[PDB]
Amino acid sequence: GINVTDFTRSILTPRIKVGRDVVQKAQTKEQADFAIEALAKAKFERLFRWILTRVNKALDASFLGILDIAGFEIFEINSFEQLCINYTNEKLQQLFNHTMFILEQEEYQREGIEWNFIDFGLDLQPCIELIERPTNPPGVLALLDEECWFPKATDTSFVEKLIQEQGNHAKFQKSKQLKDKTEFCILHYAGKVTYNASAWLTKNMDPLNDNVTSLLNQSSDKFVADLWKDVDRIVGLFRTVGQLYKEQLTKLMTTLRNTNPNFVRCIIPNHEKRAGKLDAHLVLEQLRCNGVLEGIRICRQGFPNRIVFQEFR
Amino acid sequence: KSEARRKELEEKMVSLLQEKNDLQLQVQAEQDNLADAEERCDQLIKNKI
Amino acid sequence: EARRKELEEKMVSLLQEKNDLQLQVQAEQDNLADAEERCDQLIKNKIQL
Amino acid sequence: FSEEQTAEFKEAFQLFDRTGDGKILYSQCGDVMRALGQNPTNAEVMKVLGNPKSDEMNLKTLKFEQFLPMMQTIAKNKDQGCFEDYVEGLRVFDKEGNGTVMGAEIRHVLVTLGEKMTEEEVEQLVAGHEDSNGCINYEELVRMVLSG
Amino acid sequence: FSEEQTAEFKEAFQLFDRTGDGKILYSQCGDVMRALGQNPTNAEVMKVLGNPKSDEMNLKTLKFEQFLPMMQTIAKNKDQGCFEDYVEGLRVFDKEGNGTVMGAEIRHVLVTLGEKMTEEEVEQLVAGHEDSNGCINYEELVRMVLSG
Amino acid sequence: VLHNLRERYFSGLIYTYSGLFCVVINPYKQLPIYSEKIIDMYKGKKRH
Amino acid sequence: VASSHKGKQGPSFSYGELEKQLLQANPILEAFGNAKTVKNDNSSRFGKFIRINFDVTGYIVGANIETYLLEKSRAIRQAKDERTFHIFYYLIAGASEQMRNDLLLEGFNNYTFLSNGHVPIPAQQDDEMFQETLEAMTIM
């Protein structure tokens, strides 16, 4: 229920904007397909942002935060989507390491319970600072929150700017010769992961025919008009997805350092999706990657139950 | 009729306490973000020079 | 009926307190508006330089 | 009709009188048709009235055996307007499709289109059914005139 | 016991009957006893009832010279507390050590310990002896439990 | 170390106390440990 | 567990009102954001944080689930042996004849952006899973 006339008349002739005025063009076969495609998918995203807030609308002194990560996603074709996933995933081993070792001891130390601090050589922050960090030499996200805005900048030069800023860093590993495809491996705990960088720019950017969109803005339906009232952000010739994701990442993960941790240390028995299938070397790997030997030598000494002692006296 | 308002005012204040901490948590954060941006700007000003 | 109103005055207080915090939030995102702006300015500025 | 309800139908007609003289006018006819159970188009009335102007509409009298063939002629009546037609009927001015219209247009359209209303006819009908933005949602306004 | 107070007990028995023949349910024993100047723990009574579970606790019957001996066989008593015992035994929610007691926790102990109180039983003993932050002055909560 | 986790998922017993944090191996299965038995037994209960 | 016993086996029991909605929150989201992959056939195409806000006395007052990244990229073209968001496949299957012609339903594979035809899922049948999620909506 947008306008029927004007959907296609936008989707074929963008009465758009070059400079700061109205510019007409017919679109090519090619230009017409790609834009409409973006529209198809983007409507489902607009929909979810409506939906999850109507869910919480019905669902909402203390609280219990829990973390379902769409997670540790090593497929073949690992795009941006999969990177910043395996980023919070990276952070989450480093949350165990910063918690069951450190902050679990610091929940013990917020108390002064008899706790000898034990550290095991498991700080992962360099692999995070590789993906995360804005200035100094930039991180994977940041370099793209920059290269989102530049024309002579390319998914190729994204990885080139990463080989440039990182290189020597003992948590990064440039690809197996694929400059031509441009991919990079970083040393995430549970395996070296390949990400491929083609199309990431326009993924951290999201462009669309602003014309059809401004009509989706002026729609009939409460849903479409709520979903699309955010027209301002569409670019035709704004602050990125990923940096706004950092303007939410810090809302995910600073609250987490205010919250006492409880952990779910999830191993995969098979890389084949299956019920029941364990592999003897596959688990054993993750018993090292998730840090079990060492994770023992803290909480093996340590306490499941807590409950306040002065009340207990 | 005078009991029922009283007992309730009490509790809703604890709910305004839930929001109260979180607002200072955002104050903490926005003052971080600002400073992040100032240090980056302070850098770009001096690098301009 | 008078005890109730004492607690009502007290409610409005905590509401005001929510508001100095939420006003400082609204101070800090605009503080940060001029900050963010300056950087992205000095970035374009830097590109030419 | 049954002499049961026709007794009642008679009473409501008699309670419409002004003096006792037995004569409810071509005017009030419309309200008697209503009050018994009808909601005539002012046209449905005019049809069985015999097409008068304001003068003999005010001057000509009716009695009950002049009225009962009228009430009977309508009652087993052609087509009765559903919720669905009516909402789309008010939906007409929803500049986009929203489900909502400003209570000013809505107060007005009923005072300019079809069987035109006065402000009195509209305010009592519509008021308190706009929201905190001054939109009347039409969907409930339609249901309101139905179950009434 | 004197015949006087025992007559009052004869009534506090007589009232509480089932088939109409001098028969009180096991369940009622301690509660009637409690009103009769006594606070016999469920554990104390369970001894002098012979360990029923909920089924035959609800089903088994007393009669007066089973009840009145039971009353007596607890009534002349061993440990039963005083203020000094119960200020320590009610400093029992001091959180830091504060001369005032924990609001949720006083409820919880009552659900969580030995003689598990319902929600109902918990709330009634506690309610409105806390303040704005939910600190209860136990020094008084003690005397409240110990006399009344 | 290997010996104690290898066999622990496989013994049905996915979440493994290594202290508080429980090392879990996702079965992809309707594990029976979620029921109102496992609620009203776990209901505010004492972790023994 | 934390919530108020409405007075008061397997899965069969009377949950509280909101606590019912706490369960039913998630199958709504798992229609609108969950998609098969080569790895997981009920994959979550959004990652999320969850929160269970407890009051002064301690019961569940709040349940705050927060989305970061919707893996929207698939919604057009999923790779070999992968599915888009569940609800699509549901809507085509559990359509009632009125909203089958209202919400404009042609059959499976009349959409080009649903690739691999219609891939089935193990031990879940999209057909009824439609009807389920619709209930879950009315509970929330």
E60: Cα separation from own chain's centroid: 21
Is D95:A220 a contact under the CB 8 Å cutoff? no
Locate tokens 């074929």: which residue?
A12
Partners of F22 in beta bridges: A264, F17
Q: Angle at CA F18, nearest 5°, toward A73 and A191? A: 25
Main-chain dihedrals φ then ψ at residue B45, nearest 5 degrees: -55, -50
Q: Which residues have a Cβ under 8 Å from the Cβ of G56 and sit 6 or more positions away?
A: A61, B11, B14, E103, E104, E134
Kind and range of the H or E run holding A264 = strand A264-267
Identify residues of A whose CB sits under 8 angstroms from chain F CBs: 96, 99-100, 104, 261-269, 273-276, 278, 280, 283-284, 287, 290, 292-293, 295-296, 298-305
User: How distant, in Å, are the alpha carbons of C25, D86, F35, G110 from that of G72?
Assistant: 32, 40, 35, 21
Q: Which two tokens stand for residue B43?
A: 């850098």
Annotate G26-95 with three-state secondary structure.
HHHHHHCCEECCCCCCCEECEEEEEEEEECCCCCEEEECCEEEEECCHHHCCCCCCCCCEHHHHHHHHCC
Q: What is the residue extent of each domain of chain E?
A: 1-79, 80-148
The answer for A17, left when phi > 0, alpha when psi is -120 to 50, beta otherwise, is beta
Q: Which residues have a Cβ under 8 Å from the Cβ of G46 and sit 6 or more positions away?
A: A48, A52, A70, G29, G33, G34, G67, G68, G69, G70, G71
Is B23:C18 a contact under the CB 8 Å cutoff? yes
Is G46:G70 a contact under the CB 8 Å cutoff? yes
Give the burial class of E116: count Cβ atoms within 10 A of its Cβ; 0-12 exposed, 13-18 middle, 19 or more buried.
exposed
Burial letters for D63-79: b for 16+ Cβ neighbours within 10 Å, e otherwise?
ebeebeebbeebeeeee
Give the burial class of D131: count Cβ atoms within 10 A of its Cβ; 0-12 exposed, 13-18 middle, 19 or more buried.
exposed
Q: Which two tokens stand for residue D123?
A: 């305010």
3-state class of A161 per DSSP? helix
Which stretches within chain D are classed as H helix?
Answer: 3-15, 29-36, 42-49, 54-59, 64-75, 83-91, 103-109, 119-126, 138-146
Q: Which two tokens stand for residue D140?
A: 């409930």
The single-letter DSSP state of residue A98 is I
Interface A-D, measured as beta-carbon pairs within 8 A, has a size of 15
Q: Which CATH number fits domain E1-79: 3.40.190.150, 2.60.120.620, 1.20.210.10, 1.10.238.10?
A: 1.10.238.10
Spatial distance between the Cα atoms of D117 and A162, rounded to a whole number of angstroms: 73
Q: Is B18 on the interface with G (CB under 8 A)?
A: yes
Partners of D101 in beta bridges: D136
Is A44:G75 a contact under the CB 8 Å cutoff? yes
3-state class of F27 per DSSP? coil
Is A160:A150 a contact under the CB 8 Å cutoff? no
3-state class of C10 per DSSP? helix
Locate tokens 């056939």: which residue?
G41
Spatial distance between the Cα atoms of G4 and E119, rounded to a whole number of angstroms: 11
Is A207:A38 a contact under the CB 8 Å cutoff? yes
Distinct helix (H) and strand (E) counts, chain F:
2, 2
The single-letter DSSP state of residue F36 is H
Is A45:G39 a contact under the CB 8 Å cutoff? no
- Interaxial angle between packed helices D138-146 and D83-91, expressed in degrees from 0 to 180 and rounded to the nearest 10: 140
- Helix/strand/coil percentages in chain F, nearest 5: 30, 10, 60
Q: Which of E100, E103, E94, E85 is nearest to E139 (CA)?
A: E100
Locate tokens 């012609």: which residue?
G101
Q: Which two tokens stand for residue B12?
A: 């809703």
Beta strands in F1-48 (DSSP E): 16-17, 22-25
| Residues of A whose CB is below 8 A from F7 | none
Spatial distance between the Cα atoms of A79 and A95, rounded to a whole number of angstroms: 24
Identify residues of F whose CB sits under 8 angstroms from chain G CBs: 34-37, 39, 42-44
Give the burial class of A208: count Cβ atoms within 10 A of its Cβ; 0-12 exposed, 13-18 middle, 19 or more buried.
buried
CB contact under 8 A, B2 and C4: yes
Q: Which two tokens stand for residue D88?
A: 């789309």
Q: Which residues have a Cβ under 8 Å from the Cβ of F48 and sit 6 or more positions away?
A: none
Is D85:D118 a contact under the CB 8 Å cutoff? no
Is A159:A172 a contact under the CB 8 Å cutoff? no
List, as one string, the DSSP characters of C30-48: HHHHHHHHHHHHHHHHHHH
User: How distant, in Å, are the alpha carbons of A146, A155, B26, E118 from that of A151?
Assistant: 11, 11, 35, 70
Spatial distance between the Cα atoms of A244 and E122, rounded to a whole number of angstroms: 49
How far apart are the CA of B24 and the nearest CA of chain C, in angstroms? 7
Is B14:C13 a contact under the CB 8 Å cutoff? no
Q: Parallel, antiparallel, or unpaired for β A193-196 and A183-186?
A: antiparallel
Spatial distance between the Cα atoms of A267 and A191, rounded to a whole number of angstroms: 13
Spatial distance between the Cα atoms of C33 and C25, rounded to a whole number of angstroms: 12
Q: Which of F34, F8, F32 is nearest to A269 (CA)?
A: F8
The single-letter DSSP state of residue B15 is H
Is B11:G56 a contact under the CB 8 Å cutoff? yes
User: How distant, in Å, are the alpha carbons of A37, A215, D139 from that of A219?
Assistant: 19, 6, 19
Spatial distance between the Cα atoms of G30 and G42, rounded to a whole number of angstroms: 8
Query: Within a 13 Å sphere around the CA of E131, how many CA atoms are in the beta-carbon half?
Result: 8
Q: Which of A215, A218, A213 is nearest to A234 (CA)?
A: A213
Q: Which residues have a Cβ under 8 Å from the Cβ of G43 and sit 6 or more positions away?
A: A70, G34, G35, G36, G37
Q: Parallel, antiparallel, or unpaired for β F22-25 and A264-267?
A: parallel
Kind and range of the H or E run holding B18 = helix B3-48
Q: Which of A156, A152, A200, A160 is nearest to A181 (CA)?
A: A156
Locate tokens 């973390």: which residue?
A67
3-state class of D92 per DSSP? coil
Q: Which of A229, A247, A211 is nearest to A36 (CA)?
A: A211
Q: Which of A254, B32, A251 is nearest to C28 (CA)?
A: B32
Cα Rg of chain D, angstroms? 18
Is A155:A205 a contact under the CB 8 Å cutoff? no
Give the burial class of D2: count Cβ atoms within 10 A of its Cβ; 0-12 exposed, 13-18 middle, 19 or more buried.
exposed
Q: Which two tokens stand for residue F37?
A: 């038995």
| Residues of E whose CB is below 8 A from G56 | 103-104, 134
Nearest residue of chain G to residue E105 (CA atoms): G57
How far apart are the CA of E130 and the nearest CA of chain G, in angstroms? 13
Kind and range of the H or E run holding E135 = strand E135-136
Spatial distance between the Cα atoms of E1 and E6, rounded to a whole number of angstroms: 6
A88: Cα separation from own chain's centroid: 7
Spatial distance between the Cα atoms of C48 and F6, rounded to a whole number of angstroms: 60
CB contact under 8 A, A1 and D94: no
Spatial distance between the Cα atoms of A45 and A33, rounded to a whole number of angstroms: 19
Q: Which two tokens stand for residue A300?
A: 């093996």
Kind and range of the H or E run holding A66 = strand A65-66
Q: Which chains touch C (3 or more CB pairs under 8 A)?
A: B
3-state class of D104 per DSSP? helix
Spatial distance between the Cα atoms of D117 and D114, rounded to a whole number of angstroms: 9
The reply to whether E80-148 shares the fold of E1-79 is yes
Partner-chain residue, chosen from B14, B17, B29, that has the shortest CB–CB distance to A250: B29
Spatial distance between the Cα atoms of E110 and E121, rounded to a whole number of angstroms: 8
Spatial distance between the Cα atoms of G33 and G69, rounded to a whole number of angstroms: 10
Q: Which chains touch G (3 or more CB pairs under 8 A)?
A: A, B, E, F
List, as one string, the DSSP characters of A189-241: SS--EEEE-TTHHHHHH----HHHHHHHHT-SSHHHHHHH---TT-------H
Q: Which residues have a Cβ under 8 Å from the Cβ of E92 and sit 6 or more positions away?
A: E101, E109, E138
Q: Which residues have a Cβ under 8 Å from the Cβ of A103 and sit 6 or more positions away?
A: A257, A260, A261
Nearest residue of chain D to residue A218 (CA atoms): D96
Is A73:A85 a contact under the CB 8 Å cutoff? yes
Q: Which two tokens stand for residue D135?
A: 């939109």
CB contact under 8 A, B47 and C46: yes
Cα Rg of chain C, angstroms? 21
List, as one string, the DSSP characters of A2-58: --HHHHHHHHH--EE-SSSS-EE-PPPHHHHHHHHHHHHHHHHHHHHHHHHHHHHHH
Query: Within a 13 Å sphere around the CA of E146, how many CA atoms are in the beta-carbon half?
Result: 16
G98: Cα separation from own chain's centroid: 23
Spatial distance between the Cα atoms of E44 and A190, rounded to a whole number of angstroms: 60
Locate tokens 């915090």: which residue?
C21
Identify residues of E whose CB sits under 8 angstroms from chain A CBs: 93-97, 102, 105
Q: Which two tokens stand for residue D5?
A: 């309800």
Locate tokens 């600073």: which residue?
A254
Identify residues of A whose CB sits under 8 angstroms from chain B CBs: 61, 134-135, 247, 250-251, 254-255, 258
Cα dihedral sign, A301-A302-A304-A307:
positive
Locate tokens 């990652």: which residue?
G47
A204: Cα separation from own chain's centroid: 11
The single-letter DSSP state of residue A261 is P
Spatial distance between the Cα atoms of A85 and A133, rounded to a whole number of angstroms: 16
Length of chain C in terms of residues written: 49
Spatial distance between the Cα atoms of E144 and A98, rounded to a whole number of angstroms: 49
| Residues of A whose CB is below 8 A from E102 | 311
| Residues of G whose CB is below 8 A from E103 | 56-57
Question: Resolution, rounded to a tenth of an Å?
Answer: 20.0
Spatial distance between the Cα atoms of F20 and F2, rounded to a whole number of angstroms: 19
Nearest residue of chain B to residue C36 (CA atoms): B37
Q: Give the largest Cα separation in chain C, rounded.
A: 71
| Residues of E whose CB is below 8 A from A308 | 95, 105
Is A139:A131 a contact under the CB 8 Å cutoff? yes
Do chains G and D touch, with touching meaning 3 or more CB–CB pairs less than 8 Å apart?
no
Burial letters for E61-86: b for 16+ Cβ neighbours within 10 Å, e otherwise?
ebeeeebbebbeebeeeeeeeeeeeb
3-state class of F14 per DSSP? coil
Method by which the coordinates were obtained = cryo-EM
Do chains F and D touch, with touching meaning 3 or more CB–CB pairs less than 8 Å apart?
no
Report which residue type is found at G110.
N
How far apart are the CA of G51 and the nearest CA of chain B, in angstroms? 14
Q: Which CATH number fits domain D80-148: 3.30.360.10, 1.10.565.10, 1.20.1090.10, 1.10.238.10?
A: 1.10.238.10
Q: Angle at CA A92, nearest 5°, toward A86 and A93? A: 100
List, as one string, the DSSP characters of E39-87: ---HHHHHHHHT---HHHHHH-EE-HHHHHHHHHHHHS-S----HHHHH
Q: Angle at CA F25, nearest 5°, toward F19 and F30? A: 115
Q: Parallel, antiparallel, or unpaired for β E101-102 and E61-62?
A: unpaired
